[PDB]
Design a protein around this ligand. Structure first.
Ligand SMILES: CCCCCCCCCCCCCCCCCC(=O)OC[C@H](COP(=O)([O-])OCC(O)COP(=O)([O-])OC[C@@H](COC(=O)CCCCCCCCCCCCCCCCC)OC(=O)CCCCCCCCCCCCCCCCC)OC(=O)CCCCCCCCCCCCCCCCC
Ligand SMILES: CCCCCCCC/C=C\CCCCCCCC(=O)O[C@H](COC(=O)CCCCCCC/C=C/CCCCCCCC)COP(=O)(O)OCCN
Ligand code: SF4
Ligand code: SF4
Ligand code: SF4
Ligand code: SF4
Ligand code: FES
Ligand SMILES: [Mg+2]
Ligand SMILES: [Zn+2]
Lengths: 376, 97, 112, 125, 208, 115, 176, 96, 230, 48
């Protein structure tokens, strides 16, 4: 179904077009990722986090890298952290464009999708220049980043960033004040603050209901404590408030990107510790220790001291977490992945009480669901 | 750019903005596809002296978790996990959209 | 006086001082039925007594909110009701008793 | 409330393993031998459970190594031999256990290399 | 020790240790152990019978207020007599903190469903049941969530094989999709990577 | 002793009662299943298969294991009734595309190395 | 630090009321949306004339795999098997033996292109720059078997794409 | 160094050609067999041996960081030549 | 009885008189890094990788040769021990060839593993490396002498276990080399064992050359039938 | 090329009508570009 947003089988009980019951059946994209991770080394498991939520690739890489770095007791260098925050905000732009335009497309407003996907294409080009891939980059690694930025990337990121606000403005002209859009979005899928907290909601699904919580502000990571931005807050807990929150979050991401462009420091890009991060190729081809460490890091991988962590980030879809258990070897013993879409879809049935079919379509759109992270 | 001025005027009037100022197609202001070679600075551990690895070994400073209250083994003011959060401030930049 | 608590589903409270006093008195009454040497009773009594004193000493709602550190007195009321419900549950559960069972010797041993 | 069940533990009907892979399988419970190419002993600390080797053949295309054995890769790690035996028993697998082999304590003496009348004296150094 | 080593935070460590002591004193009936990890994460190891009380306390206490259940999962450790380790992750917005609660069970012992305490658990407990086979008592609607209809066994269990026992293919004679015993063109190649030399002296176990 | 906690039944009698109830429910469901899924089997075949699946686990003597088996059978029944299952899932019980594997020594010796 | 997105109150003056009545009855914001679409109608489309025009790429782009040689024509690969060890998809299969002149060379080098995730970890792991992901991306096949590459196919890819692969490596190796 | 088998099939650098009674040759009928024509063993056998006036020489395959890891080759044996274990190039001291 | 009490990292243990520091550390389950010590060969003490600090002693001792003294407190993880291991690994790797991708010892190398575990992660050696000519000791044991770390395990095994005095060291200092000095085939029914005990890729199996890597192999513990020893 | 076109439309190829053996008057595809012109055409470099 076009409105399904992936391989989702939603079983509904209907009286006329009124929805009496929603039963989301998932698992049509369960690939058994966590067992597979248990069969890999820590570097081999990284590309799985690209494919969990395929619209926020580097954010998932960052969450996993933070978990592994916390377990390794090491620290990424400052330039790497600035690169991580910059590309996390670019990724948030990508995700919010995808969410807003696919929501509008379900509702029926097909045009803004085509306007915004050219911008998405320009950001895919940024991804590709840095890593050689437009989507599953695998750029963020448990030691920093894989490669330094190419010699003219910052200028192009600046050129893109100084035009994007007008595209957001055109989107808002299309949608924000349209009476049809407001009729399809205002007072649809209203959730109270206490219900949102109890059901496990996070991100926009909290902020639309007035709860003042953003993980970048409350539990900052990387260099998020050094950037300035506002957190959008809703008033009514409906789809209109969440749409406004996402648009304003796009604007605040532009703000953060400008700050990151003007504040990128020099230095190395991965932790200067060759028992965790691979050495440079010239060193690998000149020095005995560098060659030994390259060999061992690419065959066996680094060992992680025993212990378990729960690391969470403010991914564009909500709180994204990893419960990572190390038994002391170079392979993870356990990796549980916490995806906000799981709880949001588990609450979809609650949010659709007393609504019609089209309202349920709008609610699925407003929950910002990608089933790679839901099923794993 | 290529478009005749009258079409530019019609575009500006319909959109309500000066379209030419912020064109969405990259005409010539982007970086060249060929660049000079880089040099890339070395890390802090690239010293030739006073660089013993045992003084910069983060993996070996991890320890097993500290045990509080094993079961197998004064007023006492009540405590909390952390101090209460401070209330947020209302965005001196733009408080209301 | 104040409109829009700001949280969806949380109504604005008229007369919040009286509600808070009633709730804290009920909480202390319930705690009075717990054994005096139980840690839950003394801790909850201490915090409840401080909050009740703060409510009694501050007639102003915004100044009281800033003193209580509880985030918008309607939330303080909700938390008081939550604590009262928990107090009744703890009375029924009696978690101050000695540990029910001791786990196997290698149950929490990690790694392996 | 406790009901005082009297029988041996048995979970085969709940695991979902096909009966062929429950009755005809033999597991080995053992401490793996030290790899003779190295001196480290860190891989000889825990007990291992592993299944019997089944048929592997050649793929007609590409000549890869094909198997039809779903348990050909499964290795379990245990703290003690008793835990491994209990796991195998409750899962219904026939097992063979091997007692742990440790290197015997050896009497070393550097000075013996230079014995006045003994055969131990080194001809070279 | 400066540039490449993760910095410490002793203030948060002290606060979490004190709060763990607080929780242990308030609920001696269930709390078996309290730990503060080196990177400031607080874990409370309890008895299974105290799943519902502990969590309820941690959700409703004025000094606790962990009103959000971030995650709930299981870990399989076959060497333990109680195979499965149930892990609850809770977040407090009022105090901007996180807590972990751990308990244990085996194959035949149910755990109390905590849907009443947290609505979020519903799908988490269904997922634990599906992947590990841990039954949850008094669950509103307990059934498989991730696996295929009619799928036998629990995939996340350590004993279960990585590629399972059956595969699917379309068969033209019966004109439908059929399930058959797994055959692999190329077998997954098992690697032995563990180094025979010890990496971390701080975690060395006694020689028994 | 042995200090175990039950799921539903305290002894084998209650577990057998639950088994009988689940068997009744499956027996009643079989004709509706044959009608709804448009299966080419008879109702007799379906009830025979239900009996065979029940008898696969006749050797169980633990009330907790029996309780879990009844829970799984109830899960499967709920799944079948609501049509979550498709015709392929129902027909997976009959193994219609699986060639019969022999059990005597000589045929096994002829085909390959597996016992 | 937060802002409100929907906490604004409407003016109640007669002028404001008449403007809102005009908006309701004469559909002003709908004409605004029509104007936006009409504006986009007169812009130049962002479409490119494929296959004549191509999308921009980078020297770091990961494409079809290739096995390279030294300038002498000798293969670079020495069968260290690091690419096979690092591959997260287990897409690489390697068999090696001493060559007739005693050289350490492969006798089997397969990449299953329908297992591969195109991560580029193998070219990072290779210590002699033997395995690369070349720039090509237009290699769709009509059968599944054509995507199971052996050593001959990969050596042919290297021979076919060396001119561009060397120029791509020269432009990026100082970042590696 | 290509050469055909008695069946007309090209023999690869590896040396594998399907046998006369091997059915697998049917996979090439109506199609072709992929064979790389530049045999590395033959191409490296054409390179001239480098003469150097030192007992120990160094090889990195050329190109600096674009070659292989740098190795040192002893050249004391005069009955043979020093061969790089990475690139296959040969070195000798001026003899006779 | 005759047992004496010594401490490994402040922990008491009872050992027989004449027990070396290495064996006492092994009693508590700690393995001292080694290259030249083999518990079935005579003690050499040459590699110097086993140097450890004894409490209240300024000089590190060689754990593989030094007998424990009553009341001693070994300190296997002190700064002095770690710096000793780092320096000895540095001297070992100074002249070692960059041969890991072509070395059969690759994933099974004690030198590699102990470099990863106890050594530094970098080189500050800026000179040229030494290179030595290869020896031919028969069709079973491949020889790549540049890789030799001069442990002398092969010499002690051949002299003491095999009963042959064909192996030795010629020259001295940096130029000291392990070999036979003449064209000789080290042929004996126990010869192949010098491949196992050699910690580096200097001595490798000629039949096994280049065919496999250790991480891909599956291990089946079995018995030999080539004779009646089993 | 035409540098006044926007990025993407500033470089293009008019394919040959006769490749190795097949008629390519209508049947063209991107795989007919040789690697050096492939590098120039996909804007991996500025130098033809
Ligand atoms: C009805 C009135 C039609 C007048 C008209 O089409 O001209 C539009 C022409 C389009 O301007 P633009 O595309 O916005 O400016 C970019 C240049 O046109 C860029 O122009 P160009 O360099 O691409 O020119 C290529 C050339 C050749 O273009 C073609 O051959 C392709 C189109 C052929 C159509 C048949 O275009 C034409 O000469 C055809 C113009 C329209 C003919 C139909 O401008 C006007 O004449 C305005 C007239 C009133 C507009 C309302
Ligand atoms: C002297 C005596 C004179 C007599 C009086 C004459 C003056 C009359 C003044 C008033 C005339 C108003 C006529 C308009 C009728 C509809 C107005 C209206 O209220 O409709 C809107 C909604 O109508 C719409 O907006 C339509 C939505 C769909 C729009 C589709 C495309 C938009 C139209 C494009 C241009 C139209 C061109 C039409 C002319 C074509 C030429 C034949 C109401 O809906 P809501 O805003 O949701 O509020 C009501 C409930 N609270
Ligand atoms: S690109 Fe990645 S998946 Fe593909 S062969 Fe290389 S390492 Fe394996
Ligand atoms: S391609 Fe490179 S990494 Fe792979 S086996 Fe050959 S030399 Fe080793
Ligand atoms: S012996 Fe070990 S360190 Fe030396 S080249 Fe071989 S693998 Fe590398
Ligand atoms: S060849 Fe091996 S065993 Fe012999 S001295 Fe050298 S490193 Fe030691
Ligand atoms: S092991 Fe003691 S000196 Fe070598
Ligand atoms: Mg050896
Ligand atoms: Zn070379």
């Amino acid at each position: 179904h076009p409105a399904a947003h992936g391989v989702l089988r939603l079983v509904m009980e209907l009286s006329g077009e009124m929805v009496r019951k929603c039963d989301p059946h998932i698992g049509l994209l369960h690939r058994g990722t966590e067992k597979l991770i248990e069969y890999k080394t820590y570097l081999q498991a990284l590309p799985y986090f690209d494919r969990l939520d395929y619209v926020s690739m580097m954010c998932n890489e960052q969450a996993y890298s933070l978990a592994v770095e916390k377990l390794l007791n090491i620290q990424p260098p400052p330039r790497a952290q600035w690169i991580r925050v910059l590309f996390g905000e670019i990724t948030r732009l990508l995700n919010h464009i995808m969410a807003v335009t696919t929501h509008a497309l379900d509702i029926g407003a097909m045009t803004p999708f085509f306007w915004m996907f050219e911008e998405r294409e320009k950001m895919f080009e940024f991804y590709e220049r840095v890593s050689g891939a437009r989507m599953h980059a695998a750029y963020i690694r448990p030691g920093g980043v894989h490669q330094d930025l190419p010699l003219g990337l910052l200028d192009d990121i600046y050129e893109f960033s100084k035009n994007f606000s007008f595209r957001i403005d055109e989107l808002e002209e299309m949608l924000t004040n349209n009476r049809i859009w407001r009729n399809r979005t205002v007072d649809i899928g209203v959730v109270t603050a206490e219900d949102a907290l109890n059901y496990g909601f996070s991100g926009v699904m909290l902020r639309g209901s007035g709860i003042q919580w953003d993980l970048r502000k409350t539990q900052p990571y990387d260099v998020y404590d050094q950037v300035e931005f506002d957190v959008p807050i809703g008033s009514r807990g409906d789809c209109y408030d969440r749409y406004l929150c996402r648009v304003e979050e796009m604007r605040q991401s532009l703000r953060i990107i400008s700050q990151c462009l003007n504040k990128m420091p020099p230095g190395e890009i991965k932790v200067d510790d060759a028992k965790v991060s691979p050495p440079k190729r010239a060193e690998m081809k000149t020095s005995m220790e560098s060659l030994i460490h390259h060999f061992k890091l690419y065959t066996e991988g680094y060992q992680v001291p025993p212990g378990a962590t729960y690391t969470a980030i403010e991914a564009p879809k909500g709180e994204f977490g990893v419960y990572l258990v190390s038994d002391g070897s170079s392979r993870p013993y356990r990796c549980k992945i916490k995806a906000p879409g799981f709880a949001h879809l588990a609450g979809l049935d609650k949010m659709s009480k007393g609504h019609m079919l089209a309202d349920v379509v709008a609610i699925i759109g407003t929950q910002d669901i990608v089933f790679g992270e839901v099923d794993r | 750019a290529s478009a005749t001025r009258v079409i530019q005027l019609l575009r500006n009037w319909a959109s309500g903005r000066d379209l030419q100022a912020k064109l969405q197609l990259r005409y010539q202001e982007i970086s060249k596809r060929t660049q000079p070679p880089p040099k890339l600075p070395v890390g802090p551990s690239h010293k030739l002296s006073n660089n013993y690895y045992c003084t910069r070994d983060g993996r070996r400073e991890a320890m097993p978790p500290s045990i509080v209250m094993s079961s197998q083994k004064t007023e006492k003011k009540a405590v909390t996990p952390a101090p209460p959060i401070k209330r947020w401030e209302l965005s001196k930049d733009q408080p209301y959209l | 006086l104040k409109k829009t608590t700001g949280l969806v589903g949380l109504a604005v409270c008229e007369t919040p001082h009286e509600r808070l006093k009633i709730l804290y008195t009920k909480i202390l009454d319930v705690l009075g039925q717990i054994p005096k040497n139980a840690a839950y009773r003394k801790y909850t009594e201490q915090i409840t007594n401080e909050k009740l004193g703060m409510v009694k000493a501050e007639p102003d709602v915004k100044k009281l909110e800033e003193q209580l550190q509880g985030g918008q007195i309607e939330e303080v009321i909700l938390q008081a009701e939550n604590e009262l419900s928990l107090a009744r549950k703890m009375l029924r559960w009696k978690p101050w008793e000695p540990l029910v069972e001791e786990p196997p010797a290698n149950q929490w041993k990690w790694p392996i | 409330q406790l009901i005082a069940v009297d029988e041996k533990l048995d979970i085969t009907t709940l695991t979902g393993v096909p009966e062929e892979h429950i009755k005809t399988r033999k597991v080995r419970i053992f401490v793996p031998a030290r790899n003779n190419m190295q001196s480290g002993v860190n891989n000889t600390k825990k007990w291992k459970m592993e299944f019997d080797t089944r048929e592997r053949w050649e793929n007609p295309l590409m000549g890869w190594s094909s198997t039809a054995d779903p348990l050909s890769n499964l290795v379990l790690t245990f703290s003690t031999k008793e835990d491994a035996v209990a796991f195998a028993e409750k899962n219904g697998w026939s097992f063979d256990v091997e007692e742990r082999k440790v290197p015997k304590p050896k009497s070393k003496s550097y000075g013996a290399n230079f014995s006045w009348n003994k055969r131990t004296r080194v001809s070279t150094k | 020790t400066r540039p490449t080593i993760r910095p410490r935070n002793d203030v948060v460590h002290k606060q979490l240790s004190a709060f763990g002591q607080y929780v242990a004193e308030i609920l001696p009936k269930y709390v078996q152990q309290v730990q503060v990890s080196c990177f400031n994460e607080l874990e409370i190891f309890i008895h299974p019978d105290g799943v519902i009380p502990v969590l309820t306390f941690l959700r409703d206490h004025t000094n606790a207020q962990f009103k959000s259940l971030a995650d709930l999962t299981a870990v399989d450790v076959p060497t333990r007599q109680n195979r499965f380790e149930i892990v609850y992750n809770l977040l407090s917005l009022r105090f901007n903190s996180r807590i972990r609660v751990k308990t244990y069970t085996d194959e035949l012992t149910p755990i109390e469903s905590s849907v009443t305490v947290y609505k979020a658990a519903n799908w988490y407990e269904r997922e634990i049941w599906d992947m590990f086979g841990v039954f949850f008592a008094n669950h509103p609607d307990l059934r498989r969530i991730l696996t295929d209809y009619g799928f036998e066994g629990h995939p996340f269990r350590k004993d279960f094989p990585l590629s399972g026992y059956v595969e699917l293919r379309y068969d033209d004679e019966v004109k439908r999709v059929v399930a058959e015993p797994v055959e692999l063109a190329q077998e997954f190649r098992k690697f032995d990577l563990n180094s025979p030399w010890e990496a971390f002296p701080a975690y060395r176990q006694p020689p028994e | 002793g042995t200090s175990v906690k039950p799921i539903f039944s305290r002894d084998m009698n209650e577990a057998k009662r639950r088994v009988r109830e689940l068997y009744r429910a499956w027996y009643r469901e079989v004709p509706n299943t044959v009608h709804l899924f448009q299966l080419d089997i008879s109702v007799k075949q379906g009830r025979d298969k239900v009996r065979e699946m029940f008898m696969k686990n006749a050797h169980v003597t633990d009330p907790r294991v029996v309780d879990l088996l009844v829970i799984k059978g109830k899960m499967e029944l709920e799944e079948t009734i609501n049509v979550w299952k498709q015709r392929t899932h129902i027909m997976r019980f009959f193994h219609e595309t699986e060639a019969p594997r022999p059990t005597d020594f000589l045929s096994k010796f002829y085909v390959g190395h597996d016992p | 630090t937060y802002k409100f997105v929907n906490m604004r109150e409407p003016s109640m003056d007669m002028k404001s009321v008449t403007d809102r009545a005009a908006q309701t009855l004469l559909w002003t914001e709908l004409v605004r949306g029509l104007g936006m679409t009409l504006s986009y109608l007169f812009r130049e489309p962002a479409t490119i004339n494929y296959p004549f025009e191509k999308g921009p790429l980078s020297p770091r782009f990961r494409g079809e795999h290739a096995l390279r040689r030294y300038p002498s024509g000798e293969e670079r690969c020495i069968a260290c098997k690091l690419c096979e060890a690092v591959c997260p998809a287990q897409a690489i299969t390697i068999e090696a033996e001493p060559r007739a002149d005693g050289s350490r060379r492969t006798t089997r080098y397969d990449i299953d292109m329908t297992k591969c995730i195109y991560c580029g970890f193998c070219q990072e792991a290779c210590p002699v720059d033997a395995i690369v992901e070349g720039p090509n991306f237009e290699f769709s096949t009509e059968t599944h078997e054509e995507l199971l590459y052996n050593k001959e196919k990969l050596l042919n890819n290297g021979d076919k794409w060396e001119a561009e692969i060397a120029a791509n490596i020269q432009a990026d190796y100082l970042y590696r | 160094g290509v050469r055909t088998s008695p069946t007309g099939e090209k023999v690869t650098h590896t040396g594998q050609a399907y046998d006369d009674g091997d059915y697998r040759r049917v996979r090439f009928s109506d199609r072709q067999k992929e064979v790389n024509e530049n045999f590395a063993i033959d191409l490296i056998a054409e390179q001239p041996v480098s003469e150097v006036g030192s007992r120990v020489i160094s090889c990195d395959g050329g190109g600096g960081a674009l070659g292989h890891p740098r190795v040192y080759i002893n050249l004391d044996k005069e009955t043979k030549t020093g061969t790089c274990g990475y690139c296959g190039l040969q070195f000798r001291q001026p003899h006779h | 009885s005759n047992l004496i009490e010594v401490f490994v990292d402040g922990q008491s243990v009872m050992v027989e008189p004449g027990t070396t520091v290495l064996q006492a550390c092994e009693k508590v389950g700690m393995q001292i890094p080694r290259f030249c010590y083999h518990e079935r060969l005579s003690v050499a003490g040459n590699c110097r990788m086993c140097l450890v600090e004894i409490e209240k002693a300024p000089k590190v001792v060689a754990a593989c040769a030094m007998p424990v003294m009553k009341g001693w407190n070994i300190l296997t993880n002190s700064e002095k021990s770690k710096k000793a291991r780092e320096g000895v690994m540095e001297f070992l790797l100074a002249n070692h060839p960059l041969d890991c991708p072509i070395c059969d010892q690759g994933g099974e190398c004690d030198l590699q593993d102990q470099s990863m575990m106890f050594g530094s992660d970098r080189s500050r050696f800026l000179e040229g490396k030494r290179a030595v000519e290869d020896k031919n000791i028969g069709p079973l044991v491949k020889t790549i002498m540049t890789r030799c770390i001069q442990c002398t395990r092969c010499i002690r095994f051949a002299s003491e276990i095999a009963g042959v005095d064909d192996l030795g060291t010629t020259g001295r200092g940096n130029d000291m080399q392990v070999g036979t000095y003449i064209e000789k085939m080290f042929m004996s029914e126990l010869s192949g064992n010098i491949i196992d005990i050699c910690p580096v890729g200097a001595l490798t199996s000629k039949p096994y050359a280049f065919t496999a890597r250790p991480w891909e192999t599956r291990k089946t513990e079995s018995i030999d039938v080539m004779d009646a020893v089993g | 090329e035409d540098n006044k076109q926007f990025f993407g439309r500033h470089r293009w190829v008019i394919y040959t009508t006769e490749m190795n053996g097949r008629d390519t008057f209508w049947d063209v595809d991107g795989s007919m570009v040789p690697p050096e012109w492939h590098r120039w055409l996909h804007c991996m470099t500025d130098d033809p």
